[PDB]
Design a protein around this ligand. Structure first.
Ligand code: SAH
Length: 215
């Protein structure tokens, strides 16, 4: 595992991770965390769970990871770990209890559309059976269609129940609910995307897919 703290990366062992995790009730993983504001909120609000967040781009996490590693009085949080990793090559995590993928783009977005099940299966691998998941799709990936969504139509609560659920099941994800999130609900997630989306004139910008990992 490759921990990010400010501009520093430090590899550490699975054994060290296990000792850390063993002190908490459960683990939450944010995949593609970007600037890392969301997991910082999650860790702040959930002191009894260990929050792990990763991104392919280590530079994005510099500021917040440095703050999280500081003393408590300066915004430090003991239950928050930022890692440098892609969704294609996840860290050796096991038994994650809650998985978030918020506003993905690029190969992570292609992955969560499930035309191929490999990425979904790789993410399911780090989770225990019964883990909860939230995939929050940025619908602007279809406004207009970006290269990575190919010919996929923009998903809706109904259409997702139709063509996404079967794909998720093939990959071991039980898609239980699909619904639009109000802009205020998106804002509650505390991602950097709130700012980008503030100027949107669309009714909804995000579709939330939730369920459980069921291999
Ligand atoms: N295959 C992949 N593996 C890991 N991260 C990926 C990825 N493909 C895209 N990403 C990352 O996913 C992020 C999408 S932007 C979303 C950032 C964050 N979830 C937020 O809501 O603010 C980007 O930071 C990008 O670097």
């Amino acid at each position: 595992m490759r921990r990010v703290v400010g501009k520093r990366v430090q590899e550490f062992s699975d054994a060290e991770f296990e000792q850390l995790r063993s002190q908490y009730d459960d683990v939450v993983l944010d995949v593609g965390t970007g600037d890392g504001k969301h997991p910082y909120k999650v860790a702040r609000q959930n002191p009894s769970r260990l929050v792990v967040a990763l991104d392919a781009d280590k530079s994005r996490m510099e500021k917040i990871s440095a703050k999280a590693a500081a003393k408590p009085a300066k915004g430090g949080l003991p239950n928050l770990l930022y890692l440098w990793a892609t969704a294609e090559r996840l860290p050796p995590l096991s038994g994650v209890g809650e998985l978030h993928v918020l506003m993905p783009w690029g190969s992570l977005l292609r992955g969560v559309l499930g035309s191929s099940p490999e990425m979904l299966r790789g993410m399911a691998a780090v989770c225990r059976p019964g883990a909860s998941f939230l995939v929050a799709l940025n619908l602007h990936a279809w406004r207009p269609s970006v290269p990575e969504v190919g010919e996929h139509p923009e998903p809706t609560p109904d259409s997702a129940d139709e063509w996404l659920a079967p794909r998720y099941a093939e990959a071991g994800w039980k898609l239980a609910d699909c619904r639009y999130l109000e802009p205020e609900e998106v804002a509650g997630l505390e991602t950097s995307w709130t700012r980008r989306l503030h100027s949107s004139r669309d009714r909804f910008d995000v579709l939330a897919l939730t369920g459980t990992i069921s291999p």
